Amino acid sequence: MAHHHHHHMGTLEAQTQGPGSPEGVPPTDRFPLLALLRRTLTEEQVQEVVAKLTDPESSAQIDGVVSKDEIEKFIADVTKDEPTAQDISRVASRLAAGGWPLAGVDSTALNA
């Protein structure tokens, strides 16, 4: 009820850059790209969501519980206001592919 759905209207494949060529970066919450806080979760903000999500201790007090719905909470927490299957899927893709220690993860593919 009330909730509509704007169809896929967006051919604007955005580019990336960062400081130049972001690779070899350590898993540090404070990247230069974290100077952007907006409703529309771009890569940086998604990687931030997962950077928070990946700490199972902190989540236990941020909202007070640990349940996988937490993804939605953290997304909406980033001024998204609108955690849809898109957001949950992307974030989930990051944390799913974000296999900690040596899982074969790319230290550059975390950017776009």
**Calpha distance 87→26 (Å, rounded):** 24
Query: Taking Cα atoms as reference points, which of 79, 90, 78, 102 lies closest to residue 27?
Result: 102
Residue 72, phi then psi, degrees to nearest 5: -60, -45
| Cα–Cα dist 14/75, whole Å | 21
Contact assessment for residue 88 and residue 51, using Cβ atoms and an 8 Å cutoff:
no
Both tokens of 47, joined, read 């990687």
Q: For 36, phi and psi rounded to 5 degrees?
A: -120, 115
CATH of 1-112, one of 3.30.360.10, 1.10.150.430, 3.40.190.10, 2.60.40.10: 1.10.150.430
Contacts of 78 (CB under 8 A, 6+ apart): 37, 41, 45, 48, 49
Phi/psi region, residue 56 (left: phi>0; alpha: psi -120 to 50; beta: rest), is: alpha
Method: NMR
